[model samples]
Target chain A: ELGFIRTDPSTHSGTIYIDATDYRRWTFIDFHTQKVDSVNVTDSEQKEPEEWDIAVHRYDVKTNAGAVLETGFTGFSALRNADAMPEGAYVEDVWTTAKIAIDMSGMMDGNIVYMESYYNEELSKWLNVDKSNMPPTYTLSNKVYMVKLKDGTYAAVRLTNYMNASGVKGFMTIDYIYPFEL
Target chain B: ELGFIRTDPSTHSGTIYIDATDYRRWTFIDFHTQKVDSVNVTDSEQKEPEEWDIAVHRYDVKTNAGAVLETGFTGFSALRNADAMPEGAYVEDVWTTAKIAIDMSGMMDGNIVYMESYYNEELSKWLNVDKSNMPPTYTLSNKVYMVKLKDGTYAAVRLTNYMNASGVKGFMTIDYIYPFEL
Candidate 1:
C-alpha cells in the first residue's frame, strides 16, 4: 500500500515518489518498511516521533526522532556504508521558520506575497539553490545524506529529482538504501 | 543621506529599513555608509562583489565578497565583540536554487504554483519558521550574526523585525553595529 517501489530488495534500496504539490500537506515515509506510511497529512492531524521516520512537505524534510548528516559524496556508490560518519556532523531538526513565496500576480496586478512555512534545515539539504538564474533553478546536492534512524541504525538517502520526466514539479523521487552497513 | 539612521555615533550602531516587497528586485546596502545604495535592482543588473555589502530580497539576505556566521547570542548587546568567533562557523554565499510559491487562486481556480527564485541560504538566516500555525508564522532568530566585511573588518547584525508597526510585511528593520571590536 506504500507509494515507494522497491527497485532492488537485495540491496535494500528503492525509489519513493512523493507528491508534495500542496503546501499544506506532508508525505511521510517509514524507511524500515521501505514504503510511504502516509501521504497528504494535514498539519492538524500530524503525528511526529512515531509511525514515520522521514516526512516531506514540498522541499523541506524532517526525521521524526533522528538526525541527518550531509556526506559530500557525489554518488551513492561512493558512500557504500555509513559506519564512518563523524559524530559531530550529525544534525537534528530544530523548531525553525521558513518564508513561502505566495504569488498574487495571478490575482492582484502582478505581485508575490511571502508567508511562513514549516521546515527542517537539517534534513532539508537535498538541493542547492542557484541564484544566478533569472527565476533561479534547483539542482540536486549530488551528496548522500546519512540518516540516523530512530533505532540508532543508519540509512543513506538521495533526493534524485524534484520533478518527473514530464517536468511536473513536487513529484519528488528519492533513492535510498537501508540496513546501511555500520 | 543613507537610509539607515545612526542612533549612536560612539558605538557606530544604526537601524536600516529595507523594503523588499518586489520579488524581481533587491535592495542593496553599503554597511560602510550605513545607507541603502540602491533599491529594486533586477537580476540582470545584479552586481555581486561590488557596490554593496548586504543585499535583501524578501526574506532572503546576501553579502558581497564576504561571509556570515551565526553567533547564537540572544541580544545585540550580549555580543559585544567578534573576537573569538569560530573560523569554521563563517559561511560564504554559494550558488543554489529556491522554490517560490505562485498563488493562482484568484485566477484559474484556487491554486498555488511553485517556481524557482534566487536566494542565498548562508546569509538568509534572520527568521525561524513555525509550521504549527495554519499558514505558518515567522519569528526573528534573536541571534546575532558576525559579518566579515570585504576589508577584513567585522560587524554584528540582527534582523530585528520583518514588518512595520501596522504589520505591513517586507518592511525589514535591521539593527547593526559596525567597526565591531575584534
Candidate 2:
C-alpha cells in the first residue's frame, strides 16, 4: 500500500508518497518499477542480492549495493551528462545515529529547553530538518544526488519534498532518471 | 479554545488537555481559574506580574515568576507536603537549546544517518522524548516536581502524560495541588 503518482514518464520521474508516518517499517524501492519489492529488509534479509536499488526509511535514503554523492546541480534538468560527475566523489553508506531535538518556551524570558535523542541514521542528505518548533519543518536540499545502483549502474536522483498538499510530513517525493544519460 | 477537563478537585488537580499541537504560539494558563487569561504573552507582555502561574509550549512547562525542582518522588500521590521540598533545590528557568535527531536505515549493512538540530529548552523534565521514530514516542517522567508560583507561593505539580487516550501528542496532562499543604 503506497501513495505514488507518476507525473512524468519521459524522464522516468514521478512522485512517491511512502506512508512513512510510522517509523517501525522500511520501504524498499526497485526504481525500475518505482515500487517497494520488500519490507523489513534491514533486519532479516540480505542486501547485496536484493532487486531493490534503493531503500528508504522516513526522510533518509540508501542504496542496496552502491554509493551516492552530491551533484552540486540544482535541478533534474541540470543533470544531463552523468559521466561529468567526479569518479572518486561517491561515498558509501555508513552506520550512524541521527540526532533530533524538541524546542520549548516559557512565560519568562530565556525560559526554553531542548530535548534530544539518537536513532539509527541512514543516508540523510535529502532533507534539512529544523526541529526548533513543533511539527519539525522540512526543507529539501536544492542540489541533486548521483546514486550508483545495486548492479553497478547509475541514476540521477533528487528528493523533491517531504510533505504533501495537506501539510502532512513523511511524504517522500523524488525525481530520478535511470541508466541516466540525459 | 482549549481541550482541558477537570478530572479531580480535592487537590486542585485535573487533566489539562492543552491543544499544544502547534508550536508557533505559547499557551498561558491561570491555575486559579484553570484557564488561559492571555495569549502571546511571551512577546509583548512582562512576565513577573502575570496571573497565569504556568505557561505551556508543547511538552515543556514554565512558571511566570517562580522556580521548579524535581521531588524525587514517584507520583502525585507521593508528594503531599510542599514545604518538605528542599529550599535550595529549585532551579530557575534558563535559556538553552534542545537537540533532536532523525534516524534512517539502508539496504546494505551500516547504512544510517542522523540529522541533528537545536531548539529552545525551557524547564523540560516532564517528558522523555524519543524522536528516532516517526510520530516520536514520549514517556512521562515518574517523579513529581514542586513549582513556586508567581505569587511567592508553592504548588506540587506533576506532569502526568504528553499524549491523550487517542494517542495524539501534545495533550499535556498534569496533576497538581496549588497552595499545596497536603
Highest lDDT scorer:
1
Off by over 4 Å in 2: A1-3, A37-49, A81-83, A97-123, A130-137, B1-182
Q: Tell me the deviation in Å of residue A45 in model 1.
A: 5.9
Best by TM-score: 1
State the displacement of the C-alpha of residue B47, model 2, in Å, after optimal TM-score superposition.
43
DockQ of each candidate relative to the true complex: 0.01, 0.03
**Candidate 1 C-alpha error for residue B75, in Å:** 56
State in Å the error of residue B49, model 2.
45
Write the residue-wise lDDT of candidate 1 on A78-168 in tens digits. Answer: 7774457666768877764334433322222334444454455765879766757654567778677888888988878898887643244
Error of 2 at A40 (Å): 5.7
Count the clashes in each prediction.
10, 19
- Tens-place lDDT per residue, model 2, B150-178, is 67777666777665342335567766666
Off by over 4 Å in 1: A37-49, A81-83, A99-118, B1-182
